[PDB]
Design a protein around this nucleic acid. Structure first.
Ligand SMILES: Cc1cn([C@@H]2OC[C@H](OP(=O)(O)OP(=O)(O)OP(=O)(O)O)[C@H]2O)c(=O)[nH]c1=O
Ligand SMILES: [Ca+2]
Ligand SMILES: [Ca+2]
Length: 427
DNA sequence: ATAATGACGCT
DNA sequence: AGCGTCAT
């Protein structure tokens, strides 16, 4: 009877990251309702991050800045920096690399996003156990940790609830048994208290964190108490936690697959997936799905913390929505070159920082109408990091899709240009 | 007219 | 390889 408590895994999530990045750069933005915005033209810009002060008014991501200034008129606005006509997030990627470095010290991480890392803390927690002489774990070692499920049984202050739940946990603790899963979860947690404290001391950035036995519980744990907090979710808390957890809130169940688990099976919460046999599930959703599903509703999952703190593709895209769609040869060529240019700037910096080289160029477009994010996608070779070579070669491998005899103009209008660098190798 | 960006499965 | 899914 295996129960998926082999590993200790954490998901670190920087809190309102871009907002934190701007606020470190611009002290006026601190302790204030503010938001990051890109492209001022259309309705003031689309809001891509929201400080917690501004959330309290109702302001959300993707929302237009002119609309959100209706909800919050005191909303300050850091514009994203524009470069060659495209929104340029270099500031954040640099900010992210600062944090991934600190995290790289404490253990072996997987860059999830600009904002997130998974951390496999298993070997690190074994190392620290013998380095405490099996002596207890002080509450003071966990000043921002929550214990999902606790406090239980037989208090109005939010932090007062936190101590009770941590005190119940530390009390129930089997610290003589140096292989107790619940004890590990607790040691990894103190480590995360530390790595989170190191991130803040050394960059100024606060973050939230989830600690558990796999990537999926960690991510879910990480959302339980934000910001500047961390949740520990132990095996035994899974049944109650999943008891009313909506299925779509689990990483990979947020799209169509998860939708139909609700549809086919007629449930609505994650715990309800227990009652089915694995063959039942494989039969509804496939061999690998019914398997992963059957273990997941039992809180067991085994996708590993792949050690890969760097991405595997480098991509530069630009959207031309509505009346801005490109419809001329001269337009398409100009953007292919603008994208090619930031691309070589990112590419060159990759060749010297991370010591490697992309070898294939992928070109993608998307036309007016087609609801697929990508209408076309074609692979051509990538030899020198030369912006002009890449533009021309991109145009080459997509020239055969301007279905208008008039070569001056371009139909259908293109609503997207994507240039992605892949197939890296040593350098 | 939610934009940029990225990992992976399927075939 | 080319498309579809999913997440951030
Ligand atoms: C959903 C979504 C997110 N992001 C960004 O990827 C990292 C971060 O993700 P996040 O949700 O964590 O944003 P955030 O303000 O840090 O929110 P909280 O950490 O306070 O929850 C957000 O900066 C996108 O680029 N596109 C997206 O479609
Ligand atoms: Ca975040
Ligand atoms: Ca994130």
């Amino acid at each position: 009877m295996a129960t998926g408590q082999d590993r200790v895994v954490a998901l670190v999530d920087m809190d309102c990251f871009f907002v934190q990045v701007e606020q470190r750069q611009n002290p006026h933005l601190r302790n204030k309702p503010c938001a990051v915005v890109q492209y001022k033209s259309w309705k003031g810009g689309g809001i891509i991050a929201v400080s917690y002060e501004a959330r309290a008014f109702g302001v959300t991501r993707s929302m237009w800045a002119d609309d959100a200034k209706k909800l919050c008129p005191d909303l300050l606005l850091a514009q994203v920096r524009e470069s060659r006509g495209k929104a340029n997030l270099t500031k954040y990627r640099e900010a992210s690399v600062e944090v991934m470095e600190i995290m790289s010290r404490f253990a072996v991480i997987e860059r999830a996003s600009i904002d997130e890392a998974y951390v496999d803390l298993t070997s690190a927690v074994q190392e620290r156990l013998q380095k405490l002489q099996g002596q207890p774990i002080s509450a003071d070692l966990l000043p921002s940790t929550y214990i999902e499920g606790l406090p239980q049984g037989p208090t109005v202050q939010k932090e007062g609830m936190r101590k009770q739940g941590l005190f119940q946990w530390l009390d129930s603790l089997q610290i003589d048994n140096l292989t107790s899963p619940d004890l590990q979860l607790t040691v990894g947690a103190v480590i995360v208290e530390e790595m989170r404290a190191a991130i803040e001391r050394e960059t100024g950035f606060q973050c939230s964190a989830g600690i558990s036995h796999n990537k999926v519980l960690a991510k879910l744990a990480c959302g339980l108490n934000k910001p500047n907090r961390q949740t520990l979710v132990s095996h035994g808390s899974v049944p109650q936690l999943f008891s009313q957890m909506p299925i779509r809130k689990i990483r990979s169940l947020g799209g169509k697959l998860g939708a139909s688990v609700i549809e086919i099976l007629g449930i609505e919460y994650m715990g309800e997936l227990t009652q089915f046999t694995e063959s039942q599930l494989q039969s509804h959703f496939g061999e690998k799905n019914g398997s992963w599903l059957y273990a997941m509703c039992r809180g067991i999952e085994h996708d590993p913390v792949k050690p890969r703190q760097l991405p595997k593709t480098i991509g530069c895209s630009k959207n031309f929505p509505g009346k801005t769609a490109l419809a001329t040869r001269e337009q398409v060529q100009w953007w292919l070159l603008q994208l090619a240019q930031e691309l070589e700037e990112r590419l060159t910096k990759d060749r010297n920082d991370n010591d490697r080289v992309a070898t294939q160029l992928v070109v993608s477009i998307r036309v007016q109408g087609d609801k697929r994010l990508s209408s076309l996608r074609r692979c051509c070779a990538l030899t020198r990091y030369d912006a002009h070579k890449m533009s021309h070669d991109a145009f080459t491998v997509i020239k055969n899709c301007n279905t208008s005899g008039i070569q001056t103009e371009w139909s259908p209008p293109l609503t997207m240009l994507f240039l992605c660098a892949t197939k890296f190798s040593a350098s």
